[PDB]
Structures are given as structure tokens and as C-alpha cells.
Symmetry: C3
Subunit: 449 residues, 3 copies
Amino acid sequence: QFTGTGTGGDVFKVDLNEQFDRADMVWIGTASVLVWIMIPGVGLLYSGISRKKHALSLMWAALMAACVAAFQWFWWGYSLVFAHNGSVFLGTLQNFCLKDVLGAPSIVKTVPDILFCLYQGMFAAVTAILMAGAGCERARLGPMMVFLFIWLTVVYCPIAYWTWGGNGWLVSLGALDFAGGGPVHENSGFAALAYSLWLGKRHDPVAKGKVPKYKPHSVSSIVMGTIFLWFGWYGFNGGSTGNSSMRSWYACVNTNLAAATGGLTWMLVDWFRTGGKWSTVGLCMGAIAGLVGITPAAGYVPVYTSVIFGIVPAIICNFAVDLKDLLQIDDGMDVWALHGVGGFVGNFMTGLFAADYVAMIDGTEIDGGWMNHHWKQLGYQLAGSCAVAAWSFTVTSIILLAMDRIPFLRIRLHEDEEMLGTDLGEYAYYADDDPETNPYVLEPIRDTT
Amino acid sequence: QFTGTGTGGDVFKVDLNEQFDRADMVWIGTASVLVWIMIPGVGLLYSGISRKKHALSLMWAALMAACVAAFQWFWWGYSLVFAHNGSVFLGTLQNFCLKDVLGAPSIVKTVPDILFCLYQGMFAAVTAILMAGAGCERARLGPMMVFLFIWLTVVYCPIAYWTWGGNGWLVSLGALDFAGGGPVHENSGFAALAYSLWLGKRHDPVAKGKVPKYKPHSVSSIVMGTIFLWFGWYGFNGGSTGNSSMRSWYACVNTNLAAATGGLTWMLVDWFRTGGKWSTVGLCMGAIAGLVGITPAAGYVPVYTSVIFGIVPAIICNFAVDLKDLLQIDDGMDVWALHGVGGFVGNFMTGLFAADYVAMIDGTEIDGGWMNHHWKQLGYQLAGSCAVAAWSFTVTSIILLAMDRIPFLRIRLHEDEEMLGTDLGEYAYYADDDPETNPYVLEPIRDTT
Amino acid sequence: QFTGTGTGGDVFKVDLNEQFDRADMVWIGTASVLVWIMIPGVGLLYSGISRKKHALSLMWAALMAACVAAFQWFWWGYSLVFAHNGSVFLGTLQNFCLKDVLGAPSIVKTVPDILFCLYQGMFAAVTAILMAGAGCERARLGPMMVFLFIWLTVVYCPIAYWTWGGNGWLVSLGALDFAGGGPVHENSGFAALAYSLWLGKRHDPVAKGKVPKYKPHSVSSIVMGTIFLWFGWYGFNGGSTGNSSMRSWYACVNTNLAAATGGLTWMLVDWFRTGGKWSTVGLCMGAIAGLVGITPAAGYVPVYTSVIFGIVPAIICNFAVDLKDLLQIDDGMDVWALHGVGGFVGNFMTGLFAADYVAMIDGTEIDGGWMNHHWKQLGYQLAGSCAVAAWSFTVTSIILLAMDRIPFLRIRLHEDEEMLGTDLGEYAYYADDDPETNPYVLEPIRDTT
Ligand SMILES: CCCCCCCCCCO[C@@H]1O[C@H](CO)[C@@H](O[C@H]2O[C@H](CO)[C@@H](O)[C@H](O)[C@H]2O)[C@H](O)[C@H]1O
Ligand SMILES: CCCCCCCCCCO[C@@H]1O[C@H](CO)[C@@H](O[C@H]2O[C@H](CO)[C@@H](O)[C@H](O)[C@H]2O)[C@H](O)[C@H]1O
Ligand SMILES: CCCCCCCCCCO[C@@H]1O[C@H](CO)[C@@H](O[C@H]2O[C@H](CO)[C@@H](O)[C@H](O)[C@H]2O)[C@H](O)[C@H]1O
Ligand SMILES: CCCCCCCCCCO[C@@H]1O[C@H](CO)[C@@H](O[C@H]2O[C@H](CO)[C@@H](O)[C@H](O)[C@H]2O)[C@H](O)[C@H]1O
Ligand SMILES: CCCCCCCCCCO[C@@H]1O[C@H](CO)[C@@H](O[C@H]2O[C@H](CO)[C@@H](O)[C@H](O)[C@H]2O)[C@H](O)[C@H]1O
Ligand SMILES: CCCCCCCCCCO[C@@H]1O[C@H](CO)[C@@H](O[C@H]2O[C@H](CO)[C@@H](O)[C@H](O)[C@H]2O)[C@H](O)[C@H]1O
């Protein structure tokens, strides 16, 4: 009388909760709340790190992104990823507006559809604020909200379906992605790169010549953002087992250790490159790099290897940030360097260090990586990383270029039509300017001449 | 040997934990921690939104309210609501100072008394900081603490008993209030209105004529407060099932969606009313309106109806804020508009959209609302809303007026006796003024002439 | 086939999770996340309370301490406390780099080693930021990180083993320490005192003569730190049962009530001592005092006695702060007064109020304290308090003095060699100075003349 389809059965005839371990459900419910607070974590981080004055407050934009993402997910985002009648590349509209989303075992069988919807919806929201942060410079809010809705639909949801969907081709191939390093981090990173290369300011003074690599808008925002991110990451990674087993807590140990060693590695790198100074910004970026790096691996690799997921992503991401000076582009490039490069590196190394005896902690069966002489695992990881980066960069490019040719949907005004943050007899007046007291978004204005 | 009364049994003879599902207990324990952080959430929100400089820091006052509320609840607050020998209108002193509060099944049978005490005590504390926030302008701290203790005792505890107590008359009548929209939001809102009409400043310059509707003290405090509130609301609503069932996670999906759609609706409303600007304050107030609106409904209504609990409260509360300009009163009116009006609207609409098949997700039995052609449900909701508003407004009025006639308990000094924030030879001196560095409350001083 | 040693068994032959209640594991996993956010809680608290401008940002230093502590714990910290082949005074290197830490029942049998490692590692990190905060004035970061690593190894880990280890002598003697009042609070407090007496500035102008007792750097940081601490303390104390029983929720009620009554008591004390003012700093310090006080007792004492663990530590710690004016030393003394004195007082009073019927709520067997006419319990508590204070003060002294004689490991430069916060032709230049925008630690510089 448990149907396994639709709502899962008739609530007046069966107790749909009997299909699940109650403790499994509580941990995934708790983990969903933890991921939610990562959303303002992202907004605080990238507002504080910025080397220029964004007119849009990214702390506030995180709440905007939480609203847009939750509506998109309810509307059809959840269905396009986690419908049960998917087609290798995408889901369907079977769960449009969460129709019949209730007590059937989800793609992750240990939790019902409705709880998996709550949990996975937080991942989409985290990705939404990463994208708004990447593309925030001189953004117009109306076009940005439309962009987020579309981008979640045709960039996030296909990549997420490939990684997590019932018939997703990356699942079937054998690619490993424990907590969504592809859909969340690598995807947003390479979409950010599309923003940088197509819409970011060229020959940017903050990135041109010998300018300071770190010039933060607000160190206290960076620290608070990193606090929220690390705190929430326990749900992000620890919840990706779908259960209450000790593999969940194993993945939390790996998460903590990769962040710790990433933070120390990046700071040590900067200590050598500067000739002896201690980078406060660097420690935080290094913790994020390690957190990103361990994301595809946390439930698959032995604890002692988690330090490598801090060390190696921190080193590589540290040097990836230097490319901003070569391109002379700042906009969007921090998100690409931490999440795009970091996610690529972590996904790659999961193919090296994944171990079948770690997955088996809760009975999960995998062939393993190079730890289990499963050599082609590395090739499965590279196939996933290249497909994510290619789809994300290409489709995000198309979206941005299409909207740029529609004057009322142009996300970022062209320089020749831009007007200095003015406000609506014969003279005009300024509406300054202090985001701490201004109740309205300082929206870019188009020139009327 | 499980007695079901007093402590529940002898700990040396029985394992009182065997009466409960351990996972049910863990979720309610976690949900209690989540509600606790809503307390500073309220303080940050109303400090940041204020159109005038409150001498009392509401972020700090939230910690004060957490202290006063926890002591009151232990003293007799818990007993007056959740004693097992209640009388239709109030509990008793049987659990004075938490005497014999341990392992008997609480009014919510899935958790023991001691855990239900922890959980429900957080609701009283949230209500306490809502009240301190409503009445904070020019408040004297001593009188305010006394006021909170008394107000929790004779306003909150009776209303909470009616809504949740074992023999509460609203329970017996069939009124629905999932997570305490009456005791927390509608109650504090209409008590705030009593403060506005009796003690708030009249002909207030910030509310007189064509003044800006939004003029926030601190947008970053508003955003941080909204972060804490939304984050904590998952425990507030999700924990109100009393269990680990998937109806808990259903209610979290409803909570997230109502907040999202409320935030977007309020911002869209302001976009039309302003002629095209994006209100940063408005998005946050709209999320709160949706969170308040869904509170009586989250575990009773189908997911697709949760968007209505964002849209409709956001529209109505947006226009309710305009009444500050008609009365020319600012003090206390934001709390009334969001929690009083929002809670009334949400409680009303629960009678329309409550569905027996949603309650049945965990075996809870209800007749339903208009969704189940149970037409008189709407009348049960209006009976509860009118009783809460009438009791809260009337008794809060009486408390405020009584204390106003006692010079050492007067909460707010009269203008003729007030003295400009001075400090204790022949000349007097100022003690400025910066709440960031002043270690003492800037307490109003009575004129000695 | 459950071995109870090493990894606990073969994951390919047995399900190691079957040895544990899943709900017990979820609560301890959640409690671990809660303790983690106490780490920045400490950093915010002591940065905001400071009566002088620390060059090191303690909010940021909390992230540094989280990194150093997590690596030390993985390296050998966990093994030195919780290896299964311990020797009365210390553990071993059997679990070096978390080797074979998996599914054997930990010293707390209701959870496996890997989860107990995650949980107890957060306690070590909280202690690390308490120590960095105590010794932060004019600290050099390199030496400070080395100091933290060494101090965790030879001060924290022995004291923790005595209190919690399988063969720890304080366990065997019968000393009670529910949530680590000795290892975390009393230990860091008396190590802080060693910093004060050996390295703190003497005849300090902020502590000399009739200077203000409270002169906070940032009240908003104090409040935010206290928010994080109280919020996280639910995991700190509530998780120390190791299980999902209602004794966990009993301990949360005690925790909340001690904080509430501590906050009110300290503020009332200052109200009398000042002649009528309301101390905003005092309320927060009082909540911390009550939280510290209840830490050794929360799962052992009846609820109505928890108010005494707020009142008595708040009074005594309030007067302990006055000793800064007698010594004319400020550096490190707040940590000693709140955690050293508070932890001593709480540990003492646990011997008075511990009750066997409270421990028996989850089947834990103890003789009790004076509540059960077990008179020698008080002597067991004093033996633990004196051993912790003596070991912590003495070994911390030795570490600080040894490093002070090694010029590249000197934590705090001597005044004759110190140079005013300068930066690396013929003239030198300043690198000001604003921690909100400076991406580098303002590291003390040694004089080159
Ligand atoms: C910010 C703008 C917000 C716009 C969001 C749009 C909100 C409303 C979307 C309408 O969606 C459908 O409405 C139907 C009814 O109107 C539902 O059918 C329902 O019909 C029967 C009862 O009405 C039930 O038995 C069915 O299970 C149930 O699917 C259906 O589920 C739901 O998908
Ligand atoms: C299915 C996709 C449909 C669109 C296909 C068009 C592809 C053409 C190749 C790229 O063309 C360039 O794209 C830029 C980006 O649009 C334009 O820069 C313009 O737009 C940039 C982004 O706003 C600004 O930085 C520049 O100032 C401004 O010249 C630029 O003129 C245009 O030659
Ligand atoms: C900020 C100011 C703080 C003021 C708060 C007041 C704190 C003390 C209140 C006293 O409350 C009563 O004290 C009795 C003892 O003194 C307890 O009886 C107790 O008596 C026996 C043991 O003493 C037990 O078997 C009983 O169960 C137990 O109820 C009783 O429970 C408790 O309600
Ligand atoms: C059981 C209840 C016992 C009390 C019953 C008294 C009811 C009388 C009806 C209302 O009376 C008014 O109440 C106001 C509020 O008290 C007073 O305003 C006074 O108090 C206000 C609040 O502080 C200030 O705004 C005004 O300046 C100040 O005139 C006002 O004088 C008084 O005529
Ligand atoms: C910031 C600087 C970071 C420095 C931190 C140092 C990180 C690496 C430490 C090496 O630790 C050991 O490495 C061995 C292998 O290299 C492991 O043996 C392993 O050997 C077999 C597989 O290799 C397994 O069956 C064993 O269980 C397993 O203990 C062993 O566990 C582990 O303790
Ligand atoms: C196994 C332990 C090995 C070391 C044993 C040495 C024990 C000697 C007893 C204490 O000696 C004093 O220690 C202080 C602390 O070192 C020194 O103050 C020096 O160091 C202080 C801390 O930096 C500064 O405040 C002072 O300016 C500076 O004179 C001081 O000269 C020295 O007489």
C-alpha cells in the first residue's frame, strides 16, 4: 500500500512515515536549516572581500536570492531535478508547483520527497546568491531577478539532474560528487567567469598593474560570512549522506579538517609571497577553498586525506586569483577562482582519494578511486568537471548576451548610457549614498539624452 | 508504572524515556535552540527599522528579555499555560518553579513535560522582546522589566492557555493555531497598539505630513535580524508538530515559501507605489509578514496555498503601515502592523485553507477548513482572533495606565518631567551618547525642579 | 563481530551503526555544530569588552584558533584524551592523525569514536580561542599559533584526560564535571592568569587608580558574542549526556535558567554599586558567568537549584573583576575572572547540589552530592579544581617563560625592543591602522637599532 510513486500512498490508509527512519529525517531537516544560513554567508563574504564599492548590498541581496530561489524551486526547479520520471538530461514538470510532493521515497531513498525538496532547495539558493554576487557590479535589480530565475532553470537544474537525478548520466557513468561540488561550486564559478569575460569591466583600475591583491571593503563582513559558511557547511556536507549514520559525522570531521588546513595553507602561502606578513583575508579565502575542495569528497575519502583537500585547493586558488591582474578584470573573478577552480580541483582529487571502505560505513557501494586501484574513476571525474564547466560557461554566456540586447532586461548598463547615481525643477539632485540608511536600492539609471 | 502525572514515574523504577520516540525528542530539542536565536532576531529587526534614535539598544534589550522571560517562565509562566489540571481559562501553580516538571507526556503527548517546557519557553521569550521593542521609546529599564514580568503573567499566559492548554476553550471550540499566531504575533501586535494609543508620542514629527515611510536607523541590523528570524522560524513552525514526522518538514517548506513570496510581494507593492524603486526595507518586512502569516497555518495547509500566506499578509501589512501617518503616531506601530495585522490575517486565512489530509500526514485529526467544506472553521478562527485582540489590548492598556500612575513604576516619563540625557559642581555635564561605547543604559531622568 | 576496539569491526562484514541509537547520534552531531559557533562567540565577546585597542582582531583570531585547534586535534589531541589505552594521566598516540577512529563505542558508549571526536574537538577549539583572547595584547601571530599548538598538547589534553579519559584519575576518584568546567573554563582562566602575571602590562593605565571598570571597545560585539555563546551553549551542555534522553533537555533548561539569573544578578549588583545605573556590559558578563557556573552541573542538579548557579557565580565574578585595579593589570584578567573564578565556583557548588535522581533520568549512576548526604563529594570537587588550576597555571607559566627566552618565538615583544605599528627611502612610513580595511595583521615589529 506504499506505492513508491506520486504522494507515496493514501495518508488516510497508511502512515507514510513508517517507510523511513525518524532519526534520518531529523538530521536532514536540521541540515536543511544549516544550509539556509549559508545563503547570507555568501552575501557577507563577497560584500566584504570586494576591492570596489558595489552599489548593491550583497548581504541584503542574499535575502533577495533566498526569495527568488525558493519560488523558482517550488515553481518547477525541484521537478526539473528530482522528478521520478526523468530522462538522462533533465527531469519533467510532473512536480510543477510541488504537485504530489510528499511521502514517496525520494531519489535518496532514506528520506521522503517533501524533505528532500526542502534540503535540496537550499543548495539551489546557495548557488543563486553565488551568481548574484558574481554579477552584482552595476547590476539592475529587476533584470537580475529575471536572470536568476532563468539561470536556475536552464543552467543549475540540468547540471543538478545530471549529478543527482534518478537517471542522470553522470550518476550512471560512475562520477562521484558527494555534496554537489559540480552543481553548486564549479557551476557558479564558471558562470561567474562568463560574467567576467562578457560583462565585467575591462582594464579595471583595481586590477591593472601593481595594485594590491587584497583591498577589502569590510574585513568584519568577510569574517562573519566565513563564520556562517563554515557553520552551515556541516549541514551541506554532513546532510549529503541522506541519513543519521556515522558516515554523516565522518564527513563533518573531513569538512572541519579541510577548512582548517585550507585556511592555514593560504595564509602560509601569502606569508611567503609577501615576505612575512599575515593575511587576514587570506585565511578566510583559504577556509572557503578547503570547504569547496572537500565538498565532492567528504563522504568518500579517508580522514587523513582531507588535509590534502585543504592544502591543494588553497594553493591553486591562491594563484588563480592572480589571473585577475593578467586579464585586468575584477568583476566576478573571486567567485570563479574560489568556486570554479576550487570545485574543479576537488572533483579531480575525489577520483584519486575515494575509498570503497569509507562509503561502506553506511552500506553505500562504490568502486572507489585510485585508493581502490579503480583507475578510470579519475576519467569519470574529468568528464563531469568538463561537462559542468562547458554547459555553465556556454549557457550563462548565451543568457547574458541575449538579455544585454533587450534594453529593459539588460543586467548591466553600457558605459555610454550610464548615469552617476542620481535621483529622479531645472536642476537635478543627488540621493546619497549610504547603504546603512538608504531604504532604496541605488539602482543604475539610463541616460535620457 | 508510567503514571502520566507529576514527574511521570519513579526514575529508579522506570525509564521515562521509553514513553517517547527519541527522534521526536531530538527535533524538538533542536527546534528549541532555533527559536532562542529569534529573540535577538526581533531586537535587531526593530532597532534597524526605527525612524528615530531609540536611547535603548534593542539588540541588547533582546538579551534582557531572554533573561526576564526565562525567569518568569520558570517561576510560574510554564505552570499557568501547561499545567495538567487547568480550568478552561488558565492553568494553575501546580508547576510553580518547575516543581515536578519531568517525564510525564506533556499536553503534546510525543514529548515529556521538561522538553515541552524548554520549547514553549522560547515562544514566551520571543513575545517578550516583541513587547519590549514595541514599548522601547523613552522607556525606563526598571519599570520595563517589571512590566514584562506582569505582562507575560496576565496577558501572554492566559492567551497561550486558551490556545494550547489542556482544557483551553479555543482548543475545545475547534480553533486552529498551528505555531501560536495568536499568543505570539496577534497578541504582541495588539498589545503594541495599546502602547501606541496610550503612551506613544502624538503628532510625531517622523509620522506627520508627507514624511518618508521608510527611514531606517540601520539597514544592516534589519537584514541581520531578518536572517536570524527566518533561520529560527524553521524551529518555530517546524517544531510545532511535536514530532519527527514528515509533517514537520512539510511545515518547513510552507514556512520558506511564504517568506519568499511575502518578501517579493511587499517589494513589488512598493515598486508600484513609488513609481519604480526597489525597497530594501520592504523586502525584509515582507518576509516577516509572510512568516507571521504562515505561523497559524504551516502544518495545516497544502504547499501551493503557502504562497497566499506570503502575498495577502504582505499586501495588507504594507497598507497597515500607512496608518502611522493618519494617527501621526510612530511608537509601537511597526509591531502592531506586522504581528497584529499579519497574525489576524493569517489566522483568518487558516480557516479557509486548512486541509484534513495535510494534518493527517502524521495522523493528526481535524475537520479542516473551507478546503474540506467545513464552513464554520472560519467562524472559529474569528472567535479566536477577536478574543486575543480584545484581551491583549484591554489588559495591556490597564497595565500601562496603572503603572503610569505610580511614579517609580512609570514606564515612560511625561514630557513635562523629562530631562535631556544628562548625567548625575554648580554646572551639570553630558554623558554622551554613543551606544557602541557607553557601558550604561542611557536611562531617562526625572526633572528635580 | 563488533570488536569494541580499533575501528570497531569490518565495515564489509558488520553495520557499525547497529551498536548505537540513531537519535543519540543525531543530537550529538547537532550539538557539535552548535559548539563550533561558540568559537567566534568567544572572539566577539572579548574583542568588544576590551578597555584597550587590541591590534589583533579577536573575531578574526577565532577563525585562526578554529584552524589551529582542528589540526592539533586531528594530529594527536584527540588521541591524547580519548584513546582507549590510556594511563591515568594521559592517553597515547594510538589514534595519531585519527588512525582507526571510526565505529567503536567511544569513552561515552552511546556514540562511536568518530562522532565523539567531532564533538570533543569543538571543546578544544573553544578553549583555544579563550587562550588566544587572554594572551592577545601585543601578540605576534606566528609565536601565538605555535603557543596554541603546544598549550593544547601539554595543558588542555592532560586536564581533559583526567576529567574525561577512560582511566582518568578524576573520573575514578568520583569528581563530577558534566560538560567540562575544568578542561575548558577553569583551565583557560588560570592559564590566562599566568599570562597576566608574567606577560601582562604592569601599572596599566586602564587599570590604575579610579578608572572606569567598564570601558568597552564595542558593545555590539559583546552582545553578538553573547548571542553566539548562549545559542551554542545548548549544544555544549545539552550534548554532554552523550544521548537523546530527556536528561539532555533537562540540562538545557538548567543552562537557560542559569544564564538568565546570572545576567540579572550581575546587572542588579552593578545597580547597587553604581547608585542606580543599568550596566549593559554587566548583563552580558553575568550571563557568561551563569553559563560557566552551570557547565559542571547542568546534567546533575535539580532545576530549581540552577538559579543558584547564576546568582552565586555572577556575584563572585563581579567582585573578581575588581582585582584588576589592585594588581593594576588588565591583560588576560577578564578571561581569568569569568572562566577561572566562574569555573572554580561552579565546580565547587556541583558538590553541594548534585543529585542522584537527576543523573538517573537517563540511567546514569552517581553517588550524588550534599543533596544525597554524600559529604565527600565536595572534597572530590576541590581536588579537581585545585589540580586543574595548579597544572594550568604552572605549565602555562613554563611555556610562556620558555618562549619568551627564544627571540623568534617570543609571543610578546619587550617594551625596549617594540616599535610603533610601522611598515617595512631614507624615511619610514605608517600603514594605518583600520582593522575594517587592512588585509594584513598589524604585527608588532622588533627594533633594528
Ligand atoms: C508570486 C506568484 C505566486 C504564483 C504561484 C502559483 C500558486 C498556485 C499555482 C496553482 O497550482 C495548482 O493549483 C491546483 C488547484 O488550484 C492544484 O490542484 C489540486 O487539486 C485538488 C484539490 O484542489 C487536489 O486533490 C490535488 O492534489 C491538487 O493538485 C495543484 O496541486 C497546483 O499545482
Ligand atoms: C544567442 C545570443 C544572442 C547574442 C549573440 C551576439 C554574439 C556577438 C559576439 C559578441 O558581441 C559583443 O558582445 C558584447 C556583449 O554584449 C558587446 O559589448 C557591449 O555589451 C558589454 C556588456 O554590457 C559592454 O561591456 C560593452 O560596453 C558593450 O559594447 C559587443 O558590442 C558585441 O560586439
Ligand atoms: C532571581 C531570584 C531567584 C529566586 C527563585 C527561587 C528559587 C528557589 C525556589 C524554591 O522552590 C522550591 O524549593 C523546594 C526546596 O527548597 C523544592 O522542594 C523539593 O523538596 C524535596 C527535596 O528538597 C524534593 O523531593 C521535592 O521534589 C522538591 O519539590 C521545590 O521543588 C521548589 O519548588
Ligand atoms: C485600572 C486603570 C487605572 C487608571 C485609569 C485611568 C483611565 C483614565 C482615562 C485616560 O486618562 C488619561 O490617560 C493618559 C495616560 O495615562 C494620561 O496622559 C498622561 O500619560 C501619557 C502617557 O505617559 C502621556 O503621554 C501624557 O503626557 C500624560 O498627560 C492622561 O493624563 C489621562 O487623562
Ligand atoms: C598542514 C600539514 C598537514 C600534515 C598532516 C599529515 C597528513 C598525512 C599523515 C600520514 O598519516 C598516516 O598515513 C598513512 C598512509 O600514508 C595511513 O596508513 C593507512 O594505511 C592503509 C592504507 O594506506 C590503511 O589500511 C590504514 O588503515 C591506514 O592507517 C595512516 O592512517 C595515517 O595516520
Ligand atoms: C623552564 C622556564 C625557563 C625560564 C625560567 C626563568 C624564570 C626566572 C623567574 C622570572 O624571571 C623573569 O621573567 C620575566 C618574564 O620572562 C622577565 O621579564 C621580561 O619579560 C616580560 C614578559 O615579556 C616583560 O614584561 C618584561 O619587560 C621583561 O623584563 C624578567 O626579565 C625575568 O627576570
